[PDB]
Write a protein that binds this ligand. Structure first.
Ligand SMILES: C[C@]12CC[C@@H]3c4ccc(O)cc4CC[C@H]3[C@@H]1CC[C@@H]2O
Lengths: 10, 235
């Protein structure tokens, strides 16, 4: 759902 | 780190890069103008995440609150950057150095001319106020930190207090920048009110732009990909 934004936040 | 002179310098050093794009070789159509504007927005969204992580305290909020603030403000922050790039060029929107659209070019895409006129009018009010670069840095950070964050239920309490402390420090920093002008106390209160009243105009324009983009997507006028697609699907 927020799949790719989580990736960039970490 | 949150004291006014250090906070303003941190915001200055956090600014994202200018993303470069040019016009197509062939005359614009409704489909090709939507393709150039959405390719630019998707790349700017990637750099926007790196900018938010540089604001003092932001990565100390819960991961859940980090995601919820960016979902709530991203279109507002793309429009505030565009307004600042266009502030000294009446009648033009400076999307990038090689993508400078005249107002009348919005006639190429159904429904976009109204949104261009909203953006150009709010740009003209910041020009009339003589908005300064350090005031711009504080108002753009307030857009990120100011949304409704109505309580939701997560599986895992200091994150809300942390958010109010950060928003208070940015507000104090904007009051400190205005106090450098040396104008009267009544004129300092009036300038603060004039800048913050324009936040509702940026939220109004971001609402009309989000509706416009979701309708162009549904009607298959423009395809959208990766980060831009994810932020739209989640909205
Ligand atoms: C979201 C839209 C495409 C992307 C546009 C953009 C693209 C990049 C940018 O820095 C600012 C803006 C604001 C106007 C936006 C448009 C308003 C309606 C349109 O669908």
């Amino acid at each position: 759902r927020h799949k790719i934004l989580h990736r960039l936040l970490q | 780190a949150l004291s006014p002179e250090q906070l303003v310098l941190t915001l200055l050093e956090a600014e994202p890069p200018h993303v470069l794009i040019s016009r197509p070789s062939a005359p614009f159509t409704e489909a090709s103008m939507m393709m150039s504007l959405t390719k630019l927005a998707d790349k700017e969204l990637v750099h926007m995440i790196s900018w938010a992580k540089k604001i003092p305290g932001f990565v100390e909020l819960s991961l859940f609150d980090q995601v919820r603030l960016l979902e709530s403000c991203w279109m507002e922050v793309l429009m505030m950057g565009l307004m600042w790039r266009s502030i000294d060029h009446p009648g033009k929107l400076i999307f990038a150095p090689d993508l400078v659209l005249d107002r009348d070019e919005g006639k190429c895409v159904e429904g976009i001319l109204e949104i261009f006129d909203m953006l150009l009018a709010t740009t003209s009010r910041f020009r009339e106020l003589k908005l300064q670069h350090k005031e711009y840095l504080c108002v753009k950070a307030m857009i990120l930190l100011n949304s409704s964050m109505y309580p939701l239920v997560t599986a895992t309490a200091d994150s809300s207090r942390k958010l109010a402390h950060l928003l208070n420090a940015v507000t104090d920093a904007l009051v400190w920048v205005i106090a450098k002008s040396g104008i009267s106390s009544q004129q300092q209160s009036m300038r603060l009110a004039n800048l913050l009243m324009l936040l509702s105009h940026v939220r109004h324009a971001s609402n009309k732009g989000m509706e416009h983009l979701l309708n162009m997507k549904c009607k298959n006028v423009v395809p959208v990909y990766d980060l831009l697609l994810e932020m739209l699907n989640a909205h």
